Design a binder for these strands. Structure first.
Length: 201
RNA sequence: UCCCCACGCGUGUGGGGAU
């Protein structure tokens, strides 16, 4: 088979101060969510990823079984976590969503910086997917990808992190690499709610 | 274009950034 991954949908409660705090600062959200897989993290067995969807919905992917009893009472409605074992096959077509921080490390300075233009952002996605065992699907008028949102996360512990929300259609090229890509996430900002590549038929 | 790790991929690549 393939390795277990767990998807948890959390519907956060606007009435909760803790929920509002985490919603306003991805650094705090990271602190909270990490509690659900704390031991696995310490043991090097975990890659926590999440996305705040556009009440507020947070999708959390973990490689190990989360324990959401760690959450404060009234913090969120926790839907039953779902274990899935992706069955990726060569040529399989999938829709995808990915909120990412397209970036490069400058050769001259050694600093990782955000890519500036939409063309650069799309090229980055194409390269990441291809090196990761996928490929964007194409059409007569361009690659099958949209940028739904291009904004900044305001992170404290003030840094601004560019967040680009991609949605489109792709195909599986190499199932082994593709599975690893889903488990690892794509690009920087993984501890801020970026990098979760979600796929579905 | 904030910090850190790896490198004889540097008009950079990959990885990390709770307790």
């Amino acid at each position: 088979g393939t390795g277990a991954m767990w998807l948890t949908k959390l519907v956060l409660n606007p009435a909760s101060r803790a929920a509002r705090r985490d919603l306003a600062n991805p650094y705090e959200m990271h602190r909270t969510l990490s509690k659900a897989v704390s031991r696995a993290l310490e043991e090097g067995r975990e890659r926590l990823l999440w996305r705040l969807e556009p009440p507020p919905v947070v999708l959390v992917q973990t490689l190990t079984e989360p324990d959401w009893s760690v959450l404060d009472e009234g913090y969120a409605q926790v839907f039953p976590p779902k274990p899935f074992h992706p069955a990726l096959k060569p040529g399989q077509r999938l829709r995808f969503r990915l909120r990412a921080n397209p970036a490069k490390r400058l050769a001259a300075t050694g600093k990782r910086v955000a890519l500036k233009t939409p063309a650069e952002k799309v090229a980055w996605l194409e390269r990441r997917l291809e090196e990761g065992g996928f490929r964007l699907l194409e059409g007569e008028r361009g690659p099958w990808v949209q940028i739904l949102q291009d904004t900044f996360l305001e992170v404290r512990r003030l840094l601004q992190v560019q967040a680009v929300l991609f949605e489109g259609r792709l195909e599986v090229v190499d199932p082994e690499r593709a599975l690893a890509t889903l488990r690892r996430g794509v690009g920087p900002g993984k501890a801020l709610g970026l990098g979760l590549l979600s796929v579905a038929p």
